[PDB]
Design a protein around this ligand. Sequence first.
Ligand SMILES: Nc1nc2c(ncn2[C@@H]2O[C@H](COP(=O)(O)O)[C@@H](O)[C@H]2O)c(=O)[nH]1
Ligand SMILES: Nc1nc2c(ncn2[C@@H]2O[C@H](COP(=O)(O)O)[C@@H](O)[C@H]2O)c(=O)[nH]1
Ligand SMILES: Nc1nc2c(ncn2[C@@H]2O[C@@H]3COP(=O)(O)O[C@H]3[C@H]2O)c(=O)[nH]1
Ligand SMILES: Nc1nc2c(ncn2[C@@H]2O[C@@H]3COP(=O)(O)O[C@H]3[C@H]2O)c(=O)[nH]1
Ligand SMILES: [Mg+2]
Ligand SMILES: [Mg+2]
Ligand SMILES: [Zn+2]
Ligand SMILES: [Zn+2]
Lengths: 47, 46, 808, 791
Amino acid sequence: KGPPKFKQRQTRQFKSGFGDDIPGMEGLGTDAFNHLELHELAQYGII
Amino acid sequence: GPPKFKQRQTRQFKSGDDIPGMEGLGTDITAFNHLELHELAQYGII
Amino acid sequence: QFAKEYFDRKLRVEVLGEIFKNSQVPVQSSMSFSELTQVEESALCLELLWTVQEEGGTPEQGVHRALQRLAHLLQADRCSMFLCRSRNGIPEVASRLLDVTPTSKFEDNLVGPDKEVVFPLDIGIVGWAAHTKKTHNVPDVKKNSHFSDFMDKQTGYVTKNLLATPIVVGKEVLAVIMAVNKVNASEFSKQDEEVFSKYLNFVSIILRLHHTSYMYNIESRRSQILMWSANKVFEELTDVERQFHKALYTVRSYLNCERYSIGLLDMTKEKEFYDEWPIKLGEVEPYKGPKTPDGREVNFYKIIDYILHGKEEIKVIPTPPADHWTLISGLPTYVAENGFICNMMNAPADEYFTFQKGPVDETGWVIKNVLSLPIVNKKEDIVGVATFYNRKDGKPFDEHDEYITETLTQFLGWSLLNTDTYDKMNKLENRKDIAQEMLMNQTKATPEEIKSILKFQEKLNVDVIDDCEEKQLVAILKEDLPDPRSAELYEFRFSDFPLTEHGLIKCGIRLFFEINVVEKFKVPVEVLTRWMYTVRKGYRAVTYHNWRHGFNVGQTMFTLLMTGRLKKYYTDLEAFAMLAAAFCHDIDHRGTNNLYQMKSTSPLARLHGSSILERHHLEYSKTLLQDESLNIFQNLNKRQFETVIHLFEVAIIATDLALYFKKRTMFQKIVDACEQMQTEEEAIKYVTVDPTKKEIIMAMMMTACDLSAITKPWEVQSQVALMVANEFWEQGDLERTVLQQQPIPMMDRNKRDELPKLQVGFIDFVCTFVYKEFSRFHKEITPMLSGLQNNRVEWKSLADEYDAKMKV
Amino acid sequence: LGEIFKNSQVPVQSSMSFSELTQVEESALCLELLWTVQEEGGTPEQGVHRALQRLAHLLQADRCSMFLCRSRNGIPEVASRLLDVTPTSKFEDNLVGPDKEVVFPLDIGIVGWAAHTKKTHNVPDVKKNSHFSDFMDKQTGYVTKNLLATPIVVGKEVLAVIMAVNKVNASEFSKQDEEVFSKYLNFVSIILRLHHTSYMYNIESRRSQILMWSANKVFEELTDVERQFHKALYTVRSYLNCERYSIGLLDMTKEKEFYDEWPIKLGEVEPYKGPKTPDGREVNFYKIIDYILHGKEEIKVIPTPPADHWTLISGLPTYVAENGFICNMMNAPADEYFTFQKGPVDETGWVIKNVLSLPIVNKKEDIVGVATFYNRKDGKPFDEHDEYITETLTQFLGWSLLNTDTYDKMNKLENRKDIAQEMLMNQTKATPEEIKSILKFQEKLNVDVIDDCEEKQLVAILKEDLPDPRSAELYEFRFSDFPLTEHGLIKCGIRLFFEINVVEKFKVPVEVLTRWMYTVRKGYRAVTYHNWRHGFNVGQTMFTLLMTGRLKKYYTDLEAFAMLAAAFCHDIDHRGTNNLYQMKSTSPLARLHGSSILERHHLEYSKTLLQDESLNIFQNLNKRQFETVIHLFEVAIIATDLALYFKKRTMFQKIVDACEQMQTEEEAIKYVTVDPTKKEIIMAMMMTACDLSAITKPWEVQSQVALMVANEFWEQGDLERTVLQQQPIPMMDRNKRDELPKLQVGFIDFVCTFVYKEFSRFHKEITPMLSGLQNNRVEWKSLADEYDAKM
Ligand SMILES: Nc1nc2c(ncn2[C@@H]2O[C@H](COP(=O)(O)O)[C@@H](O)[C@H]2O)c(=O)[nH]1
Ligand SMILES: Nc1nc2c(ncn2[C@@H]2O[C@H](COP(=O)(O)O)[C@@H](O)[C@H]2O)c(=O)[nH]1
Ligand SMILES: Nc1nc2c(ncn2[C@@H]2O[C@@H]3COP(=O)(O)O[C@H]3[C@H]2O)c(=O)[nH]1
Ligand SMILES: Nc1nc2c(ncn2[C@@H]2O[C@@H]3COP(=O)(O)O[C@H]3[C@H]2O)c(=O)[nH]1
Ligand SMILES: [Mg+2]
Ligand SMILES: [Mg+2]
Ligand SMILES: [Zn+2]
Ligand SMILES: [Zn+2]
């Protein structure tokens, strides 16, 4: 005889995948000297 | 003063020696001729 | 007569239908419950029975109907209902229905959350009734020790007599029912208590239905919160902020809160030495302020706001100021400092916390109820504070909402394993990449080593840049490389002892040039030389499995392909990949067997389950081929490169001896089938039609090349066997000292004099089969087997001497 | 009969009126029926039984009955709960147990049509309705010729169907009977609604507890599939509420090895024929975990179970693995297809009654395992609520498969990192030949390769084969490494270590010291400027500062040992690109270390070198001394970052000013030594001075070194332009080559001048350094002004 009918898995409930569709995620993944030093220090690539 | 507040509840879900049968669960282990079974081990082939 | 009720029993169905239909709708008014005939009392019971069957609506309507029924049955007035709640583990009672009077509309009786009056169980006789869960009947309440007059002062109504009975289901009290100020009499009555209880039975039925529905709803909400949080957490590995945002945003429909936010604390426990210098030197005063129990400073480095009451927006504030509407009150800082679950009703009314008493965002939203909970690590360390603001219904947070949010925060705290694991994954991957890059830099041949072989600077007078064409480089390299005929590279009897390792590199490049693959596949000369030198440097300084072994194996394959005439079955690309795999079959050999890797639980053994060292060699060869400078297979199609990679895998994995032992039989069958063919071309077609036959033959060629030293002349074979014995004895010493296990007789130094006999036992066990089958396959490989036999005789002689030495 | 007209006669005795007495007694009985539900410890079946008895008495009917509604496999069905209920009948005899029920699908039976239509159905003649079924009539030998059934619907869901059959004194159930039935069944609906809501609450509580405990056990520790699944199931044991259940894990190997495919392709072995999962893998249960809950609470694990295992004897687990359905089965042994065990399963008296089997599904919709739940604790078959609970549990396990995979990836990454680090250490570590090239024990001690010589003898022989410290101006600030080869630099470094009297004091091995020096040299790459020569120059400058600069009086011998070692290892494994390129190119170094990327990399690499027992120069000193050395090492290497020096310039200036006001050197030494922070600040400034000491060299050395630094910076700028598509700063821009002098002047006036000015103020013996710097600046000015003449 044929097997009895059986219910299918309810994959539609949580099918959804992961991404930036959640609002506010664009700015969520990642997060000192004197005035004269601000430019001279960067000009020498020290920082 | 601050009102009396509820303390955190951790004992209920605080709860492998406890779990039986875990000794034979960490790692699972699964060919040649009759004479080869000893000669291969003799020469370190396996 | 003679028919008593029988006809009435027959017609009773119509009477029951009539009375049900004509008593469901109409409402009866009557007084005092003792001037009532049984008929109208039964009709009242039917009225309340229908009222119990809500069929949709709210329990307060039925409770109020019952309360007015009781008011005009008891000859009392101003009946009241007090709903019992629990906040912070402290039970309380609020007023839900006040001043219930017969023929009084329901809307005026209901008390909203704004105007409710809350009593602790230690205040008022309602508190004692709820505490003891027993019926209380007190006259002259002014003389009672439990009566509280706060409500009387608030409403300006005096009470003299009362009868309060708590409603209890499942050992939990839900409401307290009051009838006060009996008219025209005092002391109430015992029958009054009886009717009070018998109708509070209806009230308890209604309250039980409502409470069971509410409990089911909150449990369903908790289960769905758990489902959604688990689904979002297990989607991928991510840090604290994104994981918490996903989990909290997905469950926004099950948290009945107009607004809620989460604030994350700084996780840095200790500061750097240079930041500690000003504090130690005293130039900067020590930091004084809020501190978590672990000792860290309370610094919220990021806050996520979820606004749901109006237009839904999710504001993310990095490094929020103290002016932020969440932190203006001290509740989040208090939670971070202490770690208690804080439930606050009528938040602005509190004095300790400076909650805003008006609109906060200019949108007209005012804080009314607050619930704040901490999130903890495995080490009971606070990581964040989740604050849930005023409930959607307007009622204050109760024990059930605290249950829901506490379970959510417990799950979130447990979920930090997937964040710590994410950070560990990133650190491990970065460290592995750095280690591999520095290893490749250390191993890759320096430009000076390339200039040693490819002497472009001494023949083209450039000395600076490889700006010449490939033809010039090929011409320069061809002259420098040794001639294969002079160095006996084609012969089976080739011995690498006279040549130096640099000479071996030159001979390897010459071998690559001999099979005519550099020109056909456009392999750059500089790339080829660099790859050869890198492969040479990859081999360690062990006794036997050094660069010389790799070169001997490669040259044996070159001899088999060219001198052995085994190139007829293989194309140019297959021969190229086969030679390249032969030269790298033992790259980076530590100096131990696979058994030592298994027993010692080496990282190689844990990384690769079976054929440990062979898979390691294959992986390292592929890693070498990945680099653009070292890739001799650069100018090849995707399909050709895939074929080369497949041949690499097959060759290097089949290098081992267990696979050869298991697959001897198929090679024997192939040789037997090819032996009966009448013509050479038929055999070539038979072999080349099926790719599996070519793979088996190439694997057996790998095995034959790997053991080629047996077929070398006696002078070479004695030295090679001594080298192999020394390596095995070193492995045995390592096993005895480290693993504390007695080694097998071959790897024991005390059995050194037994080396001859064992080698005899080797020759007739492993090598003789493959070499005899190859001799039967191709007659050109006849000398190899022949040489092998000669070698055996020599070893046999030595064994005989041993048999003499121990005989005396 | 009909002679006397109908009247509501007043009995006077025992009754005021017939209708009034009827109403009063009906109200009283209905009140008692409602109170039945408040009696804790009872069941709703008792209240339904009382209501059905009253209904049978009132309607003059016979055999009132109730059929409860279930949902299995997504399809509804009914099952008799109360049967043959008659007035004055015992409840125990009327109730039907789960093992004696008769199950009707919705499409057959009048009960089925009543449940489907959700409305009252009154059939006068059962033979005129196609929905009538004879199953119960032939089963029990009872004839039915009249039926009236109304379903009990709450929340748009049917709970039970209640019928009355074969009115004794009439051949039809009139409309008034239907109305009375409807109202009494409304009261029964209230009772059943209370019961169903309580059952729903219990089911949801069990589900929530399952989720709590599964989450707690999954996040407790990162483990493999087997241990994690075992923990979760063993924890949620109580909340499943099943007599026995098991889980079987399928092999996930989707591809065969090439050496296991040759016989299949050659035809030696016949191709596999049998069950297959939807992915295509062969159905091979490689582990079965059986949980025993009926008695003794046993738990067993069967690795590589046989086909004779009691779980796999029936085809249900294999069927689930093949198809992926959710299988709910009642009276499984009676089924023909799956061949369940009709008799006892094992030696104990246990039989299979109901089965619920669900698959565990990966992210890729692959089938990882099959979870089979056997007969329920109570005799009732599995409902849709048990399917709900078990489906949630299996979904949670399929989700935690991600954590299992992440654990496997963790193990693989850790093993690969360990292998790579070991191979790198083997490549970098100095070969024995290189050590013998310096410690010539073979050519001078006449000993074999194996070293059995005394340590003192090794010290004595090595001290005769090293450059003279007084010669080659090792103690002077004018030292130039140009006339020295790199092997000579290694020898001079070992001599510098000997000169401070720490090899004998701390009993460091000679071979270990030589191997460490050679390994440190080989660690430095072949870049233009940040090569081994720069490291040795920094080390020699630190030695000069300690000895010639008289700074050793502020530090102990162990501290000076640490200073020299960290100075030699301050720029190890430098790639030739500064921190800005590391951040801008998203290098793995920048992702691993946040601030001071190169300095932290050098510190980590040098500590890794010191970790090995064959290179541990601090092998023979105490644990506390080793911790002190490690902290000193960290401070020294991190201080080489010029941003930190820029931040701590003011602190060092304050320290120098405080020390300058004391007229006695002993007072200054006491002031500095008592505070470790002051020593650390002075040490950081000393490291910065050593790093920048190339400026203070004589003019020829400074010019050549500046050319080397410029050539390195131009290479970095060109590479940045090529691979980052950004314009380099003028200092690193090759097209600004002729701007090299002016920039250097600025570099002297901005960075280097403060260190040497403050050191000359602090110590007069370091005066020449500053002097040299000034001279160099003048020379650079002579090159800048000429450029203005060239313009
Ligand atoms: N007894 C003996 N074993 C050998 C000889 N040559 C190779 N072998 C074995 O064969 C193995 C070949 O694998 P390979 O190490 O070359 O990848 C060696 O590791 C060693 O175990 C030999 O001359 N005598
Ligand atoms: N312009 C210039 N910069 C230098 C000179 N010597 C060192 N530097 C700078 O100082 C840094 C010191 O870093 P470290 O040597 O610790 O890697 C160098 O990377 C470089 O930026 C120099 O002679 N001229
Ligand atoms: N004005 C008014 N007071 C009430 C009513 N029901 C109870 N109270 C009073 O509110 C009080 C709350 O505390 P108590 O229980 O001590 O006593 C209670 C009663 O005296 C009501 O319907 N109207
Ligand atoms: N013996 C018995 N049979 C019943 C009773 N109520 C219904 N049935 C029968 O069980 C049958 C189930 O399917 P049907 O509804 O078609 O018809 C039903 C009736 O014939 C009962 O109280 N006792
Ligand atoms: Mg090998
Ligand atoms: Mg540096
Ligand atoms: Zn080999
Ligand atoms: Zn430096």
